[PDB]
């Protein structure tokens, strides 16, 4: 079946992802990447306090990153290497804004410990005349590894669970990332231990496998949007906001 019928509305389907007071669309189905099974709820294990999450409020879609994709970028050059708990907060905090100001962060302010699966969209608007390729990959503990520069390479992450994005026919990388840390919970700020590496479950990272191969005088620049949903969460550990921690640098 192939009859093209673009009316006053150029025809084509648009799948949407609402899902909680925010609707974000994608005109092209994503290339998913599921690195692990869905995480069970270990609140009834580690902590016996206010055991809950926040539905309509922390299970939304906030923006955490956005960047540029150009012909200048050589073969393996990561556009982002963003930590995943974590840079949800660390993006907003360095936006000359506070964590307290946004609805998808506020319990991190009050509550001490967090556990939950993650959802991520790597949406880009590239043109059909751009011949490039990216790869969004996940690593459940990047900073803990010593020589991960060895792994920090397009070759290395192809070896593992990832998603693929090609400039033409742009395209989205779905990226379901459930919770798998060593300890079942994460600490939102400084704690009797975890005096650093606060709220870090691993980093995402997008490098390049094919530069934007542009014709003579073709459009140079491109762009990426990183979105994140925090579903299936649990926030036990009620603590005043003066105990909080404005996350570390990029």
């Amino acid at each position: 079946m192939d009859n093209p019928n673009p009316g006053p509305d150029g025809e084509g389907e648009v799948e949407l992802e609402k899902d909680s007071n925010v609707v974000l669309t994608t005109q092209r189905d994503p290339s998913t990447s599921i690195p692990a099974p869905v995480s069970v709820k270990w609140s009834r294990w580690t902590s016996n306090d206010v055991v809950d999450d926040y539905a309509t409020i922390t299970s939304r879609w906030y923006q955490i990153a956005e960047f540029v994709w150009s012909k200048d970028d050589p073969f393996d050059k990561e556009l982002a290497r963003l930590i995943l708990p974590r840079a949800l907060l660390s993006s907003i905090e360095a936006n000359s804004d506070a964590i307290c100001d946004v609805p998808n962060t506020i319990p991190f302010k009050v509550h001490a410990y967090w556990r939950g699966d993650m959802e991520v969209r790597v949406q880009i608007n590239s043109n059909k005349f751009q011949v490039g390729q990216l790869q969004a990959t996940w690593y459940y503990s990047d900073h803990e590894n010593l020589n991960i520069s060895s792994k920090r390479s397009v070759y290395g992450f192809s070896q593992m669970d990832h998603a693929l994005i090609s400039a033409s026919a742009s395209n989205e990388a779905k990226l379901v990332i459930p919770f798998k840390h060593v300890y079942p919970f994460l600490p939102t700020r400084i704690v009797p231990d975890w005096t650093t590496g606060i709220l870090d479950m691993g980093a995402l990272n997008i490098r390049v496998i094919a530069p934007l191969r542009m014709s003579a005088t073709g459009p140079t620049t491109c762009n990426v949007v990183v979105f994140i949903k925090l579903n299936n969460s649990e926030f036990t550990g009620t603590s005043s906001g003066k105990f909080y921690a404005s996350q570390i640098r990029a």
């Binding site: 001490a112 410990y113 704690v191 009797p192 231990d193 975890w194 003066k242």
Partner: protein, 347 residues
């Protein structure tokens, strides 16, 4: 009935707070640690100080991890003519510096409880267990200095409402505090005990690395020095003349630790108003290390918490731990250069 549970169910005393009408609306009574390894120092006398520990203290002194829920019985000896209200809150995530900067208001932010007392003296608060870790490793790891991780959190007991005592019952009242494993204090894995005997409290000092003043600086009494807080505090001197300050050997301490001194025999210590059995050693800037006598071991530790915490000597926080010069007393010299032993603790 020889169970780890059987033991962690008896209620052993651990604290005694004196509550008074004079206690302000905003005031704390105790800020003791919410973990089985909660101490109670007993006075005297030998170097290593003895400590009181609940049945839920002796275990898991044998185990590595515990993961349990605990509870505190606050026995408030009170008439029916005494009324007040106490708070108590388990706030997880209490680091070192953040243990202060703590009011009774921000405690009301975490799991907390308020108790009304007229004709009902005592109450029992069950201590919640909030961690990122399933089980919880030893706070005191013996015998190994850096192999010991702090407590997961602590509870406080503020005065929500000051006491109002009618003229025929006294205004100060004792708050005895007991501690035992709660409904589910668990215990994980047997390892080296962090507690010792009480039978023979000796330690043959190896080898023979007994800490004592450099050869030639004996005897030594507590005195003052114009170069040490402008003669406002006590420091060990080996003479009464110009700049005769006791020079002490340098103590090599690994990072993440602190050091101070407790003498072996109190019958050989320098004398002021009391035997200066405790002291701290730090460089003097005038090209050596000086022996600074303290009131007790706690005040020697707290000084090491501030000098090894990357501090100076001319800070007010340290100079309020220095012993005042009106404590110099008759100024008895020591019994030669008696043995001190170097204590160690993480910071």
């Amino acid at each position: 009935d020889m169970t780890v549970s059987s033991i962690a169910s008896r209620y052993g005393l651990i604290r005694r707070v004196q509550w008074k009408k004079d206690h302000a609306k905003g005031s704390l009574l105790l800020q003791l640690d919410a973990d089985p390894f909660v101490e109670q120092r007993i006075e005297g006398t030998n170097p290593i100080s003895l400590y009181w520990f609940a049945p839920v203290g002796v275990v898991s002194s044998m185990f590595m991890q515990w993961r349990g829920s605990l509870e505190y019985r606050f026995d408030i000896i009170a008439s029916q003519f005494h009324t007040g209200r106490l708070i108590v809150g388990y706030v997880p995530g209490l680091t070192a510096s953040l243990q202060l900067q703590m009011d009774y208001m921000k405690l009301k932010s975490s799991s907390y409880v308020v108790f009304d007392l007229q004709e009902s003296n005592s109450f029992t608060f069950e201590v919640p267990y909030v961690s990122y870790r399933p089980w919880w490793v030893r706070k005191y790891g013996g015998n190994y200095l850096p192999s010991s991780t702090d407590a997961p959190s602590t509870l406080f007991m503020y005065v929500q409402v000051p006491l109002i005592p009618m003229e025929a019952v006294s205004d100060t009242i004792d708050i005895n505090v007991y501690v035992r494993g709660g409904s589910s204090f668990e215990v994980c894995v047997p390892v080296q005990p962090s507690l010792g005997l009480n039978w023979n409290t000796d330690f043959i000092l190896r080898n023979d690395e007994e800490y004592r003043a450099k050869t030639g600086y004996a005897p030594y009494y507590a005195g003052v020095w114009h170069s040490f807080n402008n003669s406002n505090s006590l420091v060990f001197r080996w003479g009464s003349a110009s700049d005769q300050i006791a020079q002490w050997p340098t103590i090599s301490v690994p990072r993440g630790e602190l050091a101070f001194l407790r003498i072996k025999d109190g019958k050989q210590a320098a004398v002021g108003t009391q035997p200066w059995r405790t002291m701290v050693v730090w460089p003097s800037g005038h090209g050596y290390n000086i022996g600074i006598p303290t009131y007790n071991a706690e005040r020697a530790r707290q000084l090491a918490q501030h000098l090894y915490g990357g501090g100076s000597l001319t800070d007010e926080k340290a100079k309020q731990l220095f012993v005042p010069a009106n404590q110099q007393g008759p100024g008895k010299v020591s019994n030669g250069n008696p043995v001190w032993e170097v204590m160690r603790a993480p910071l």
